[PDB]
């Protein structure tokens, strides 16, 4: 009889919890009690980039740590040389309603998408001297919320239709679909090996996905409200999440659980962005009250604040050499800190 | 700087000029968000997303419709929200108040005013004169309400009070609601311009410290 499926699900919901609690011998704070503190940090603004006419919704760093791309309500992508501030290209969008952009790890291509349910791929290396669309990827039934390249021929995307998907750009078709979330999917992060990825959704959970097998490995469920941003730890063995809960949380793959949470009684607004420094010792988070907090990832202390925007911070990112932090905002600027 | 760097700097001046020139043309316009449930007449109040454009009295408008908890943050800087209500069914009319109370109180829409079209007044006049059913079975206060045709005037004013009440009870002064009735009607492009003029005038008084 069909009602017995709820009985079998209850037995397993107990067995997962019993296994996870048997591992819990000591906390990360009980181990890291003797390691020395970061002290205080004092990063300063080294550049301001100007030229968008409206809100900035996303940015992404290029593989060489010198180029970056930005996406805005004003209907343009812009590619910047961060050292000089010079604009390299400005690209006109076919819709104003973009929510995402990404840079290919070769520097040959850029991607964007949003409320029109399509992901567009732009070729930066034409013989005619232009930038133009190479491919339009269509098949989601809702707004695209994040995208990330694996190479010049494969890309992963997430949407408001509750799925993620993997695409072959040369064929213009899906090769796998990833199914199991019950809310809209907000954000996505690839592991350093590119064999796995994680995503977070408005049902207040995160999942671990096998790219090659096409299926779900583990699910993580500590939050009490929607997840907006997610990021792998540099070692590929842990990740962090940020939520409308007004807290960040660190999760471990091999212990299958939460290690610690970052929060304070004077912090009340939701988290828009999260990122890790090159050693993993600093965790950076962006907030709806328009400045960034910097946390000691092991001690859970707060080390300093990047105060400098006068409207909310919408995107965040650290260079692969660990030299600098970029932040974008609804004030139409983006700033670089060091 | 080198001979390549001064050439790459002159390129960026032409990008700055061409971005800024395209910034003047867009800022001429006004932007509208359109909302309303199925069979409300939303597609014909003027005659993954849809967009339509018009001009009246030398002012020109863009209007958007989506084929909403997350994406509504993208519309935090429109001039107005247009909200369309079916008045021909008394049964689903509670869903119209439930949707309206969500959009009015939303934390990212604290400064945007609403233009409200109560649609299908002809099917409402036909049913209130035919007399087979009564609003009072769904909204009991109609059994005691009387006016501020002599039959239909009682119904249409009561139904229009039910939206304006749930607005004014928590409006917080920054934004306003502008009701109208729609049928083969044609004037609706003038009605929205006469309210977009008033919204911009209400902003100009606060910027000059008059209010």
């Amino acid at each position, epitope marked *: 009889e069909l009602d017995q499926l709820r009985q079998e699900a209850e037995q397993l919901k107990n067995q997962i919890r019993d296994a996870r609690k048997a591992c819990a011998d000591a906390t990360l704070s009980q181990i890291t009690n003797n390691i020395d503190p970061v002290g205080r940090i004092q990063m300063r603004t080294r550049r301001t980039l100007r030229g968008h006419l409206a809100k900035i919704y996303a940015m992404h760093w290029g593989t060489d740590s010198r180029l970056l791309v930005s996406a805005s309500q004003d209907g343009k992508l812009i590619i910047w*040389d961060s050292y000089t501030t010079n604009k390299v290209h400005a690209i006109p969008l076919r819709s104003s309603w973009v929510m995402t952009c990404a840079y290919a790890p070769s*520097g040959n291509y850029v991607a964007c998408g949003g409320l029109d349910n399509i992901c567009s791929i732009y070729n930066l290396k034409t*013989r005619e*001297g232009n930038v133009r669309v190479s491919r339009e990827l269509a098949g989601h039934t809702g707004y695209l919320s994040c995208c990330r390249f694996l190479d010049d021929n494969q890309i992963v995307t997430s949407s408001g239709d509750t799925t993620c998907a993997l695409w072959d750009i040369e064929t213009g078709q899906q090769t796998t679909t990833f199914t199991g979330h019950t809310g809209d999917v907000m954000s996505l992060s690839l592991a350093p090996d590119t064999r796995l990825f994680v995503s977070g959704a408005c049902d207040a959970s995160a999942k671990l996905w096998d790219v090659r097998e096409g299926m779900c490995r583990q699910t993580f469920t500590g939050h009490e409200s929607d997840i907006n941003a997610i990021c792998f730890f540099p070692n590929g063995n842990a990740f962090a999440t940020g939520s409308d809960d007004a807290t960040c949380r660190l999760f471990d793959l091999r212990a299958d659980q939460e290690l610690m949470t970052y929060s304070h009684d004077n912090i009340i607004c939701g988290i828009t962005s999260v990122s890790f420094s090159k050693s993993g010792r600093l965790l950076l988070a962006g907030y709806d009250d328009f400045n960034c907090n910097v946390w000691d990832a092991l001690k859970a202390d707060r080390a300093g604040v990047l105060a400098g925007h006068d409207n909310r911070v919408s995107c965040l990112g650290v260079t692969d050499d660990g030299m600098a932090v970029a932040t974008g905002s609804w004030d139409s600027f983006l700033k670089i800190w060091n | 700087v080198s*001979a390549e760097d001064k050439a790459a700097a*002159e*390129r960026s001046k032409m990008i700055d000029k061409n971005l800024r020139e395209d910034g003047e043309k867009a800022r001429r316009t006004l932007r509208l968000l359109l909302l309303g449930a199925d069979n409300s007449g939303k597609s014909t109040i003027v005659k993954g997303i849809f967009e339509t454009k018009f001009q009246v009295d030398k002012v020109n408008f863009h209007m958007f419709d989506v084929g909403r908890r997350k994406w509504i943050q993208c519309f935090n800087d429109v001039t107005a929200i247009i909200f369309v209500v079916d008045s021909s069914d008394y049964n689903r009319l509670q869903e119209a108040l439930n949707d309206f109370k969500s959009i009015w109180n939303n934390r990212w829409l604290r400064t945007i005013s609403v233009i409200l079209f109560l649609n299908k007044q002809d099917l409402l006049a036909e049913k209130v004169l035919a007399g087979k059913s009564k609003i009072e079975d769904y909204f009991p206060e109609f059994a005691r309400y009387t006016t501020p045709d002599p039959r239909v005037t009682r119904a249409k004013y009561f139904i229009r009070k039910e939206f304006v009440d749930i607005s004014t009870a928590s409006g917080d002064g920054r934004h306003i609601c502008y009701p109208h009735f729609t049928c083969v009607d044609t004037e609706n492009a003038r009605r929205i311009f006469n309210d977009c003029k008033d919204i911009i005038l209400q902003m100009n008084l606060r910027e000059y410290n008059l209010v």
Partner: single-chain antibody
Framework: VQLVESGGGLVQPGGSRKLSCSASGFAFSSFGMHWVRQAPEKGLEWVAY????????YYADTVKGRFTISRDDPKNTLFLQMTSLRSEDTAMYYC??????????????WGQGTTLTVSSDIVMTQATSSVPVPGESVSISCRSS???????????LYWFLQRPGQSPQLLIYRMSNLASGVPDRFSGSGSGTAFTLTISRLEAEDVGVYYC?????????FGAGTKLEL
């Protein structure tokens, strides 16, 4: 992608001319444009430059005041107007496209020229004049009077290849980088002042002439270049 040219011919001393060149298949307004010349038995020499947006214009001292360079973007056309023509101006003239931003490769494509017959600069040298070369490696070297390496971390040296009877084409840009469609058997490297190009496994159709050019400062200057033989 194409550039085509008209003008040239025979001119009596002291006269004037206009050359014209028409682009097709590319975003012409976005490219900087150069005129480059060669005498009937001598190396490449640069004549003039005009920017994108017409905002800056350069000449060598041998043409300064006698020549005007101009463009007509709605018609995709490049012009050179020149007066007081001497026997010393008798040259093949080519136009060239260029574009400048982080990661670009200028001197990318060349027209096919019109021959004209009239009846503090960086000195750079190629040590050989001609070399006997198949299947073996071959190597060529160029030296500069001053350093081509700049505080920004780049070196502004280029290598050009000319096959017999054909316009020249780019091999290498900014000392190290290889131009699109050029075989992976080509390479080059150097110090701040002395540079080398290496060919691995030489073949037919690699036979030609090799020119080294600097782009540190205007005027742009060339070496004499080295010929190869089979």
């Amino acid at each position: 992608v194409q550039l085509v040219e008209s003008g040239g011919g025979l001119v009596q001393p002291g006269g004037s001319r206009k050359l014209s060149c028409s682009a097709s298949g590319f975003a012409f307004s976005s490219f900087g444009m150069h005129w480059v010349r060669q005498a009937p038995e001598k190396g490449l020499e640069w004549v003039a430059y005009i920017s994108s947006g017409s905002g800056t214009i350069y000449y060598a001292d041998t043409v300064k005041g006698r020549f005007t360079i101009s463009r007509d973007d709605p018609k995709n056309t490049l012009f050179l107007q020149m007066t007081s023509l001497r026997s010393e101006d008798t040259a093949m003239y080519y136009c060239v496209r260029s574009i400048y931003y982080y990661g670009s490769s200028p001197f990318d494509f060349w027209g096919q020229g019109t021959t004209l017959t009239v009846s503090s600069d960086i000195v750079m040298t190629q040590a050989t004049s001609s070399v006997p070369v198949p299947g073996e490696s071959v190597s060529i070297s160029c030296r500069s009077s001053k350093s081509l390496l700049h505080s920004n971390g780049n070196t502004y040296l280029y290598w050009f290849l000319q096959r017999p009877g054909q316009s020249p084409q780019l091999l290498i840009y900014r000392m190290s980088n290889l131009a699109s469609g050029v075989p992976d058997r080509f390479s080059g490297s150097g110090s701040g002042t002395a540079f080398t190009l290496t060919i691995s496994r030489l073949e037919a159709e690699d036979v030609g002439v090799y020119y080294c050019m600097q782009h540190l400062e205007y005027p742009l200057t060339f070496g004499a270049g080295t010929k190869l033989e089979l």
